[PDB]
């Protein structure tokens, strides 16, 4: 093993910069920035140099592994500019454990976390001036790492590429839910737990299908009796009253088949630490959804994650009947309550462990 | 705008400098590439480019492209045969490029005309023809890839791609040993395990590791709460046995969507049905069926199937900590045997049939 250094960086600027986009029409994963960061590896040499650069296209041999059988993993994480005019990154620790965690399931080569971080900083720093000029935009950053490997035998990559894009992003509108439990999105034993490529390729089908009927997503179901596991990308949460009669804050536990979302950990550390009510990682059926739905125990339904940080539902569709779902004539309170308290650490009106200023 | 594109409208630029071809006999898998590659852009704005002919080059990919994010890929597996007439032939391509266009919907890469995609096919091979081996035991690899090239980081469907083609020669009974932990599963009902998507593939890395660490070539793929018994690698999975009623049997795994259907193990079905020599079941195998079998020695062979190696006999499985023995090799193998010689026969035009496509 050994790992690229970020003392070693080598930087490229453009010539000619970009114009910024307005912050207030920005579409996700549309515009990017001047600059990216590659580092190359090969089981050879080892990995190279890393390189700032002018935002390009790859060159990659068309046998190149992540083409063909899906040698691939990504992260995602967000800058702020924050009330102050600093720049901060919320989390990214948190980020750099979950690529490591994937990069090895992968079998993608190792990497010190420290230095890949601290080259990520002197990416965003060059290009800081794409960090929006708002409190209610970011910066969304994407390390990829793909194997590069030019043969088609199915096998550990020896070579492989690691480069970072920067997007910025802007912006309750709740969602409607499609639930079809012919699709499966992950399974004991597969990789649903890491944010490898290969779990998303398989999914397009089911949200082409979900906007067919009218909706924004795809509730993920799984199991004889149709746990809800994920919302389309997203963790999910439920606010209700548990079968007991107590008030709950309830999320999927981590039994192989939930993505551990840095979002999901943070409303739960959150949760925890308010002390208001029961929070739970625990099972959730459509049945134990539409038995509390017909005793109105259910309060709010949301999804989480870097992009949206929440998202409420308000409908399911399930077994051809449109299931309401009382989010939004609840407040969201809880929603809310969350978005707030996230975008105040975030922007830096709350100063918190959390975050890390460029 | 353009549904699809035409054979009639292909660009040929050759390359300048030829290469020198590999000995047919030091040959790695898919290590070696041919001369020329064939390329075909799409947009949903304009729908499909013409078709490329052109030098083996690097693609040129937007670093956002969805192919590298999320896994918006799928390929395809089939051989060119230089027969004992001299002449070059294709094997079934037609269920090739029907398993590619129903790959392609499931994956939501646009349609394509598959007469279409084989001409465009049949002439790189054309251009390229003397890379395929002068051998009966070599041939040539082909690998239609179908790639995303969505330049946005939406989870979506893809508004560009890329459909490309390689060529690799590939050289030639060497029984493998499995690594069956249940702790891996390959594919899942209501997954994508029956189509030949990359996203499938990606997940097994680590298992395959493991199975090298364990001193094993490949992994048994096992399923559910019986283990059942799925496929090899990326092989189908292949059982000649006495069963339980104490009959002469082939058997496999039903395509009940968690099995790739692959051509060779469609062929091999094929051939035992027309042979009506002993019992031929799509069913169910557990790990307790076959060491049952076994400890009552009613086990005469077990293989996989695939078009790489054509068959691949088994001679043991790594199983809760012990290694157990397949008397595949102790008896012949005397149906993986006389499978590889009517289907190579039938590759290299000794026997004429219609599962082969001359030029």
């Not at 059926?285 to 038995?291: I, V």
Request: charged fraction near 20%.
């Amino acid at each position: 093993v050994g790992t690229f250094k970020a003392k070693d960086l080598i930087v490229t600027p453009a010539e000619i910069l970009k114009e910024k986009p307005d912050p207030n029409n920005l579409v996700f994963g549309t515009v990017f920035t001047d600059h990216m960061l590659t580092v190359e590896w090969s089981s050879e040499f080892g990995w190279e140099k890393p390189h700032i650069k002018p935002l390009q296209n790859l060159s990659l041999h068309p046998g190149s592994s992540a083409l063909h059988y899906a040698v691939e993993l990504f992260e995602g994480l967000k800058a702020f500019r924050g009330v102050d005019n600093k720049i901060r990154l919320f989390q990214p620790n948190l980020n750099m454990d979950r690529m490591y965690r994937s990069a090895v399931r992968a079998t993608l080569p190792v990497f010190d976390k420290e230095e890949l971080l601290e080259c990520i900083q002197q990416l965003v720093k060059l290009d800081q001036e794409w960090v929006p000029y708002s409190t209610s935009a970011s910066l969304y950053i994407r390390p990829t790492f793909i194997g590069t490997e030019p043969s088609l035998g199915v096998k550990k990559p020896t070579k492989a590429l690691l480069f970072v894009l920067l997007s910025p992003v802007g912006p309750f509108n709740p969602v409607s839910l499609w639930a079809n439990p012919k699709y499966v999105r992950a399974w004991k034993g597969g990789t649903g737990d890491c944010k490898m490529g290969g779990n998303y390729g398989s999914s397009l089908f089911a949200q082409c299908e979900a906007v067919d009927n009218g909706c924004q997503q795809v509730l993920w179901l799984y199991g004889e009796d149709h746990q809800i596991t994920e919302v389309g990308t997203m963790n999910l949460f439920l606010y209700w009253i548990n079968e007991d009669g107590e008030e709950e804050l309830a999320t999927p536990p981590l039994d192989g088949i939930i993505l551990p979302g840095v979002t999901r950990r943070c409303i739960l550390d959150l949760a925890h630490q308010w002390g208001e009510f029961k929070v739970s990682e625990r099972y959730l059926t459509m049945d134990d959804l539409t038995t509390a739905l017909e005793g109105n125990r259910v309060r709010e339904m949301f999804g989480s994650g870097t992009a949206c940080v929440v998202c409420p539902v308000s409908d399911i569709l399930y077994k051809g009947e449109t299931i309401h779902i009382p989010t939004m004539e609840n407040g969201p309170k809880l929603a809310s309550r969350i978005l707030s308290k996230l975008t105040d650490i975030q922007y830096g009106r709350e100063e918190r462990d959390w975050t890390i200023v460029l």
